[PDB]
């Protein structure tokens, strides 16, 4: 089935299948893309709380800008920025917590590398680096009553309930509830965090009919918000990163971020060569913050913090409907999908920038004045409306008993947004566009467990508005069409798998020329090679290793200083090594270690400002034992065990690393 949960691979850390958007789930060995699915088992073993926690620790292709002390995580994949708002939910956009996705309710977190506009449409934030997909927990036939308690430096106390029950004749119905409450001081100076979460995974399992509904409520409240460090006019060197426990932003910043959503999905088998599917969901996202970005002033660590209040009221609806079928034109099997999607968003977004307070990278900021932001009080007016919707047809041609697979598709994508000024209410822009966007893949299986593949596919981003400073101010440009070519090979030796991939991704780039006209005349050309090994190559020894190399070229700019230079915030070299070891010498004891490597990178387009490479080491331990007949598991996770302080580079700013962070938990199944 297209929505069948793919099985766990050897080792139980990753799965052997992942979603290919409108196409449904495909086995890794049948997918002409680089897909990785991390399992709930990994999530629980590493005590990962967010998508960022999981992905940066295990995946060679994914690095996190922002981080858990900040209000937002974003993800660099294949040398392109991926917004947390572009994280899909069973393939649907716009239904997960906007700024940072929690995963304690997640059965799977999947990564499809590279653009994928044919498979799932444009994503709302316009990301093209890759599509992260969450699969929610479902109720197993065997009843589950799981309670865990946990502690995290410095005083975060947590409880997590995971309760699953099936009812009705033949267990047709399923109910899975996750509830988390986590509250206390974080590991960063003068920061505390409250986090309630509630989730329900409901499903109906019928003969010709499958239904599901997911409800999520989540809220993150921070006292103290870590924020980027921006480069300044006369920045000549990047100062060395402060101690990660230091908090050099606005002392009395706060965040209150709330999201709740519901999404109903279903399938109906019209015949056993035809299935209809539909989804409809909505999300409310409430945003409140006062915080400051830090800006370098001078070169020896002085900063000025620039304060801001922001408020957001965001209302999103997201739907899809379609048919999946199959027939035969002789020796060719056709597996076709016709699919339409529709996203509509109403956004109220107000902001005011006031306050410029002196500070220093190496000093936790003192209590400082909060300017009066009373004007933004009251009702949040509407400032944006967005409507995205497309129709897509795709055909997977199988021949020679599935050893050769050719997939083709085309999508017509509709993009439409309106903007309204926050103070005056005036209509400032109405962008409306449509683009066709196709794909073609070929996958050949010379050996039953060796796949070779190639794909071509595109990414779509909405065009930018020319800044208020340019000779076409406020004009909204046509959408940016990214193009991916990829080839690679996957080899599955039973207990472990090796992959390789070579890709190029080209995408237009917008800047203002010498005539002060804003145009999309730049191009980024990212070519890369990716190597991966995962699985259980020895009994009780699970390994997840990988390495990436990319040349991220600014192969078309207007300036000789940046022409042909590296895209900022994209290291050329990155690597991950994870080992999980069941000790034959203690019963129930498992030890884990991870090494995360990120090469040097640049923050500026002329590449005059380099930040160093960095290394992170995690250590973990899990102890499984019985009391009164119940299974219990005590766990420890030590992130950034060496207490390394480092900058993660981005385009014009840097995110400070998180400190050494120990988390302890006890889990009991009743």
Return the bridge partners of 194, or none.
183, 221
Query: DSSP per residue over 605-617, as a string?
Result: TTS--EE--EEEE
CA distance 597 to 599: 7
Other Cβ atoms less than 10 A from the Cβ of 531: the count is 16
Q: 317 phi and psi, to 5 degrees? A: -120, 145
Instruction: Fill in the DSSP letter of residue 52.
Output: H
Q: 54 phi and psi, to 5 degrees? A: -70, -50
CA angle (208 as vertex; 203, 212 as ends), nearest 5: 15
Residue 646 in tokens: 């480092």
CA distance 333 to 213: 33
Number of continuous H segments (helices) and E segments (strands) in the chain: 3, 37
Resolution of the solved structure (Å): 2.2
- Residues belonging to the chain: 670
Alpha-carbon distance values, 512 to 231, 460, 464, 487 (Å) = 20, 21, 12, 35
Query: Is the Cβ–Cβ distance between 15 and 7 less than 8 Å?
Result: yes
Alpha-carbon distance values, 127 to 80, 139, 200, 353, 636 (Å) = 8, 32, 28, 27, 35
Q: What does DSSP say about strands 130-136 and 88-89: parallel, antiparallel, or unpaired? A: parallel
Query: DSSP per residue over 628-652, as a string?
Result: TTEEEEEEEEEETTT----EEE-SS
CA distance 381 to 378: 9
Element (H, E) at 44: helix 40-45
CB proximity list for 271: less than 8 A, separation 6 or greater: none
Residue listed under structure tokens 């937002």: 72
Boundaries of every domain in the chain: 143-669
Instruction: Fill in the DSSP letter of residue 23.
Output: G
Give the residue from 68, 69, 73 showing the smallest Cα distance to 84.
73
Kindly indicate whether the domain formed by 143-669 is annotated with CATH number 2.40.10.340.
no
Burial 500-524 (b: 16+ CB within 10 A, else e): ebebbbbbbbbbbeeeeebbbebbb
């Amino acid at each position: 089935g297209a929505e069948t949960l793919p099985a766990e691979y050897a080792g139980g850390q990753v799965a052997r299948g992942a979603r290919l958007g409108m196409l449904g789930n495909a086995d890794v060995m049948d997918a002409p893309f680089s897909i990785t699915s991390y399992t709930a088992r990994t999530i629980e073993q590493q005590q990962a709380r967010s998508v960022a926690d999981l992905l940066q620790a295990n995946d060679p292709s994914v690095r996190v800008v922002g981080g858990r002390g900040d209000l937002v995580d974003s993800y660099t994949i294949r040398g392109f920025s991926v917004q947390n708002a572009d994280v899909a939910f069973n393939g649907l956009y716009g239904l997960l917590p906007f700024w940072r996705v929690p995963i304690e309710f997640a059965e799977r977190v999947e990564v499809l590398k590279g653009p994928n506009a044919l498979l799932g449409g444009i994503s709302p934030g316009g990301s093209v680096g890759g599509t992260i997909n969450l699969v929610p927990k479902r109720a197993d036939d065997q009843p589950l009553t799981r309670v865990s308690v946990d502690w995290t430096q410095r005083g975060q106390l947590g409880t997590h309930l995971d309760i699953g029950r099936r009812f009705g004749e033949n267990n047709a119905f399923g109910v899975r509830f996750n509830g988390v409450y986590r509250n206390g001081d974080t590991a960063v100076d003068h920061q505390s965090r409250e986090f309630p979460m509630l989730s329900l995974g409901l499903d109906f399992r019928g003969e010709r009919l499958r239904l599901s509904s997911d409800l999520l409520y989540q809220k993150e409240s921070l006292e103290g918000v870590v924020r980027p460090l921006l480069t300044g006019p006369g920045t000549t060197h990047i100062p060395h990163a402060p101690d990660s426990k230091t908090r050099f932003g606005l002392r009395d910043s706060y965040l209150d971020q709330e999201d709740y959503s519901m999404v109903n999905r279903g399938e109906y088998d019209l015949a056993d060569n035809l299935t209809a599917f539909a989804s409809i969901g909505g999300r409310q996202s409430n945003y409140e913050t006062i915080a400051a970005n830090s800006i370098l002033v001078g070169n020896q660590g002085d900063i000025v913090n620039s304060l801001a209040r922001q408020r957001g009221d965001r209302r999103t609806y997201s739907a899809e409907v379609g048919l999946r079928g199959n027939f035969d034109t002789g020796p060719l099997r056709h597996d076709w999908t016709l699919s339409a999607n529709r996203l509509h968003e109403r956004l109220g977004m107000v902001y005011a920038f006031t306050g410029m307070q002196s500070g220093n990278l190496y000093q936790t900021s003192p209590h400082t004045p909060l300017p009066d932001f009373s004007s933004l009080d009251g009702s949040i007016p509407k400032t944006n409306e967005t409507d995205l919707g497309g129709v897509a047809l795709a055909d997977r041609l199988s021949f020679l008993e599935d050893r050769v697979q050719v997939t083709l598709g085309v999508r017509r994508q509709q993009i439409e947004s309106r903007n309204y000024d926050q103070t005056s209410g005036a209509r400032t822009s109405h962008d409306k566009r449509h683009v066709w966007t196709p794909m073609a893949s070929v996958l050949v299986k010379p050996l039953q467990d060796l796949s070779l593949y190639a794909n071509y596919i595109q990414g779509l981003s909405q065009g930018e508005a020319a800044p208020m400073t340019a000779a076409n101010a406020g004009q909204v440009l046509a959408p940016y069409k990214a193009e991916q070519y990829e080839i690679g090979a996957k080899y599955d030796l039973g207990g472990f798998t090796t992959t390789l991939a070579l890709f190029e991704i080209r995408k237009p780039n917008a800047y203002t020329d010498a005539s002060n006209v804003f145009r999309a005349d730049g191009e980024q050309r990212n070519r890369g090679v990716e190597l991966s090994l995962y699985g259980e190559p020895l009994d009780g020894v699970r390994v997840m290793a990988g390495a990436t190399y990319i040349k991220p070229e600014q192969n078309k700019t207007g300036d000789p200083a940046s022409e042909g230079k590296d895209a900022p915030g994209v290291a050329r070299r990155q690597a991950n090594l994870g080992v999980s070891w069941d000790t034959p010498f203690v019963d129930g004891l498992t030890l884990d270690s991870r090494w995360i490597y990120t090469g040097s990178a640049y923050v500026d387009s002329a590449n005059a400002l380099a930040v160093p490479h960095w290394n992170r080491v995690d250590l973990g331990a899990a102890y499984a034992f019985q009391v009164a007949g119940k299974p219990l598991v005590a766990r420890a996770n030590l992130e950034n065990a060496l207490g390394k302080d480092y900058w993660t580079a981005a385009n014009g700013y840097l995110s400070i690393s998180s400190p050494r962070t120990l988390s302890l938990s006890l889990t009991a199944d009743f």
